Design an enzyme around this catalytic site. Structure first.
Site, PDB file in Angstrom:
ATOM      1  N   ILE A  33      -8.201 -16.586   4.478  1.00 37.18           N
ATOM      2  CA  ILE A  33      -8.250 -17.175   3.345  1.00 37.18           C
ATOM      3  C   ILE A  33      -8.849 -16.534   2.448  1.00 37.18           C
ATOM      4  O   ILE A  33      -9.043 -17.702   1.612  1.00 37.18           O
ATOM      5  CB  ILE A  33      -7.750 -18.538   3.640  1.00 37.18           C
ATOM      6  CG1 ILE A  33      -9.446 -20.059   3.900  1.00 37.18           C
ATOM      7  CG2 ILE A  33      -6.746 -19.113   4.555  1.00 37.18           C
ATOM      8  CD1 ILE A  33      -9.447 -21.064   2.737  1.00 37.18           C
ATOM      9  N   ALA A  35     -11.993 -13.173   0.842  1.00 37.67           N
ATOM     10  CA  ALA A  35     -13.595 -12.585   1.188  1.00 37.67           C
ATOM     11  C   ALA A  35     -14.631 -13.666   1.383  1.00 37.67           C
ATOM     12  O   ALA A  35     -14.191 -14.032   0.058  1.00 37.67           O
ATOM     13  CB  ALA A  35     -13.815 -11.181   0.974  1.00 37.67           C
ATOM     14  N   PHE A  38     -20.918 -13.355   3.196  1.00 43.02           N
ATOM     15  CA  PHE A  38     -21.005 -12.632   4.194  1.00 43.02           C
ATOM     16  C   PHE A  38     -19.809 -12.457   5.592  1.00 43.02           C
ATOM     17  O   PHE A  38     -20.229 -11.296   6.740  1.00 43.02           O
ATOM     18  CB  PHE A  38     -22.153 -13.773   4.812  1.00 43.02           C
ATOM     19  CG  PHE A  38     -22.913 -14.205   4.287  1.00 43.02           C
ATOM     20  CD1 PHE A  38     -23.926 -13.419   4.250  1.00 43.02           C
ATOM     21  CD2 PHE A  38     -23.409 -15.009   3.703  1.00 43.02           C
ATOM     22  CE1 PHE A  38     -25.571 -13.231   4.182  1.00 43.02           C
ATOM     23  CE2 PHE A  38     -24.406 -15.314   2.004  1.00 43.02           C
ATOM     24  CZ  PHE A  38     -25.630 -14.640   2.898  1.00 43.02           C
ATOM     25  N   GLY A  39     -18.757 -12.888   5.278  1.00 39.56           N
ATOM     26  CA  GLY A  39     -17.457 -12.641   5.577  1.00 39.56           C
ATOM     27  C   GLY A  39     -16.813 -12.981   5.482  1.00 39.56           C
ATOM     28  O   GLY A  39     -16.440 -13.283   4.434  1.00 39.56           O
ATOM     29  N   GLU A  40     -15.140 -13.032   6.452  1.00 35.89           N
ATOM     30  CA  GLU A  40     -13.618 -13.630   5.956  1.00 35.89           C
ATOM     31  C   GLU A  40     -13.865 -15.017   6.199  1.00 35.89           C
ATOM     32  O   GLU A  40     -14.430 -15.283   7.577  1.00 35.89           O
ATOM     33  CB  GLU A  40     -13.067 -12.582   7.022  1.00 35.89           C
ATOM     34  CG  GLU A  40     -12.849 -11.542   6.413  1.00 35.89           C
ATOM     35  CD  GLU A  40     -12.172 -10.668   7.410  1.00 35.89           C
ATOM     36  OE1 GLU A  40     -11.338 -11.177   7.891  1.00 35.89           O
ATOM     37  OE2 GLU A  40     -12.914  -9.742   7.476  1.00 35.89           O
ATOM     38  N   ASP A 152     -24.559 -23.560  -9.648  1.00 35.25           N
ATOM     39  CA  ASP A 152     -23.809 -22.441  -9.433  1.00 35.25           C
ATOM     40  C   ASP A 152     -22.133 -23.701  -9.224  1.00 35.25           C
ATOM     41  O   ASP A 152     -21.318 -23.277  -8.782  1.00 35.25           O
ATOM     42  CB  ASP A 152     -23.202 -21.303  -8.264  1.00 35.25           C
ATOM     43  CG  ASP A 152     -22.615 -20.483  -8.951  1.00 35.25           C
ATOM     44  OD1 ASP A 152     -22.247 -20.029  -9.896  1.00 35.25           O
ATOM     45  OD2 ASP A 152     -22.470 -19.950  -7.831  1.00 35.25           O
ATOM     46  N   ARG A 156     -13.901 -22.615  -9.733  1.00 32.34           N
ATOM     47  CA  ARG A 156     -13.917 -21.628  -8.376  1.00 32.34           C
ATOM     48  C   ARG A 156     -14.873 -22.359  -6.995  1.00 32.34           C
ATOM     49  O   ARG A 156     -14.652 -21.361  -6.423  1.00 32.34           O
ATOM     50  CB  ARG A 156     -14.071 -20.137  -9.007  1.00 32.34           C
ATOM     51  CG  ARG A 156     -15.189 -19.290  -8.915  1.00 32.34           C
ATOM     52  CD  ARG A 156     -15.988 -18.375  -9.148  1.00 32.34           C
ATOM     53  NE  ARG A 156     -17.454 -18.438  -9.377  1.00 32.34           N
ATOM     54  CZ  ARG A 156     -18.437 -18.962 -10.222  1.00 32.34           C
ATOM     55  NH1 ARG A 156     -17.481 -19.190 -11.344  1.00 32.34           N
ATOM     56  NH2 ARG A 156     -19.848 -18.910  -9.621  1.00 32.34           N
ATOM     57  N   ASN A 157     -15.879 -22.795  -6.932  1.00 31.64           N
ATOM     58  CA  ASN A 157     -16.404 -23.523  -6.139  1.00 31.64           C
ATOM     59  C   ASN A 157     -16.209 -25.297  -5.874  1.00 31.64           C
ATOM     60  O   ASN A 157     -16.620 -25.691  -5.061  1.00 31.64           O
ATOM     61  CB  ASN A 157     -17.813 -23.516  -6.558  1.00 31.64           C
ATOM     62  CG  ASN A 157     -17.945 -22.378  -6.427  1.00 31.64           C
ATOM     63  OD1 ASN A 157     -19.110 -21.381  -5.371  1.00 31.64           O
ATOM     64  ND2 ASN A 157     -19.473 -21.492  -6.977  1.00 31.64           N
ATOM     65  N   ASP A 170     -19.796 -25.212  -2.222  1.00 31.59           N
ATOM     66  CA  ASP A 170     -20.314 -23.618  -1.761  1.00 31.59           C
ATOM     67  C   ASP A 170     -21.985 -24.573  -2.536  1.00 31.59           C
ATOM     68  O   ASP A 170     -22.403 -24.363  -3.620  1.00 31.59           O
ATOM     69  CB  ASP A 170     -19.311 -23.052  -3.611  1.00 31.59           C
ATOM     70  CG  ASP A 170     -20.019 -21.580  -2.477  1.00 31.59           C
ATOM     71  OD1 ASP A 170     -21.540 -21.237  -3.048  1.00 31.59           O
ATOM     72  OD2 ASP A 170     -19.386 -20.683  -2.344  1.00 31.59           O
TER      73      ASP A 170
END
Length: 278
Positions: A33, A35, A38-40, A152, A156-157, A170
């Site tokens: 869901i 990227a 650090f990974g998916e 941050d 989007r977070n 996040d």
């Protein structure tokens, strides 16, 4: 009671204090869901005992990580692990040695607030949206009265679940158009600057997930602010609710609201929705 990882010795150490290590074998990775740095990011369930299987998000640290990468990544789990609050994303636990490395967090069916609102454009009442803002404020009031500065904060977070309950998230790893001026220019990150960033979030939410300052270059944003430019009340956005954004976007940080206050001003607004004008 926010103990900082990076004053601690190191993750491993920070993580083991603050994150529960989970058996990899109880983690079903069902679907990608996203990227991540650090990974998916994936979706899935976790099998807790004496409790129906829990839906979860699984941030994965991709195989072949340096010992550097691994610790930067598990920094998130050391911060997140210290917070209990309805409006900060619950950690389920982590996987640090022995098995593929993970941070299992609680599933937020509706995903990130900014992609979520773009899909549901115009579909929510000012009262409904004022409510999504209240949750993000309540969580940020908590993260503040706890010693933590987000640095941050964005829409989007913030993660939305399937009750429209928005949750701060996040949390790594210990920007321009989100970041207050005294922070952009003088690296002065504080609960004060987190209130400048909440304002942008307020603008994101009320505009159903637009990009702050549109196609203006990071440099064009910095000049504009410096002159006194501030974003406008988006369509259907009440003047009062827009003014809470202006109070958040005040040059001198001491003049910005506290999240305590942002929570009440929004609470009045939900109750009697006209104040949002007056």
């Amino acid at each position: 009671t926010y103990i900082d990882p990076e004053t601690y010795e190191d993750p491993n150490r920070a993580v083991h204090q603050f994150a529960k290590e989970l058996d990899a074998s109880c983690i079903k990775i069902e679907r990608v869901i996203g990227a991540g740095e650090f990974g998916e990011v994936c979706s899935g369930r976790l099998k807790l005992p004496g409790k129906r299987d829990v839906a979860v998000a699984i941030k994965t640290l991709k195989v072949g990580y340096t010992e550097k990468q691994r610790r930067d990544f598990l920094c998130e789990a050391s911060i997140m692990g210290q917070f209990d609050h309805p409006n900060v994303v619950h950690l389920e636990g982590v996987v640090t040695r022995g098995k593929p490395v993970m941070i299992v967090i609680e599933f937020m069916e509706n995903g990130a607030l900014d992609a979520f609102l773009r899909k549901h454009d115009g579909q929510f009442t000012v009262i409904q949206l004022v409510g999504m803002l209240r949750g993000i404020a309540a969580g940020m009031r908590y993260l503040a009265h706890m010693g933590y500065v987000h640095r941050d904060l964005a829409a989007r977070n913030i993660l939305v679940n399937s009750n429209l309950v928005c949750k701060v998230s996040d949390f790594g790893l210990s920007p321009v158009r989100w970041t207050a001026p005294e922070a952009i220019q003088y690296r002065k990150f504080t609960s004060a600057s987190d209130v400048w960033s909440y304002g942008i979030v307020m603008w994101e939410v009320m505009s159903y997930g637009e990009r702050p300052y549109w196609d203006m270059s990071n440099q064009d944003v910095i000049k504009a602010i410096e002159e006194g430019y501030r974003l406008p009340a988006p369509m259907d956005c009440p003047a009062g609710l827009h003014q809470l954004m202006l109070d958040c976007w005040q040059k001198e940080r001491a003049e910005r609201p506290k999240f305590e206050q942002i929570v009440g001003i929004l609470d009045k607004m939900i109750r009697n929705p006209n104040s949002a004008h007056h």
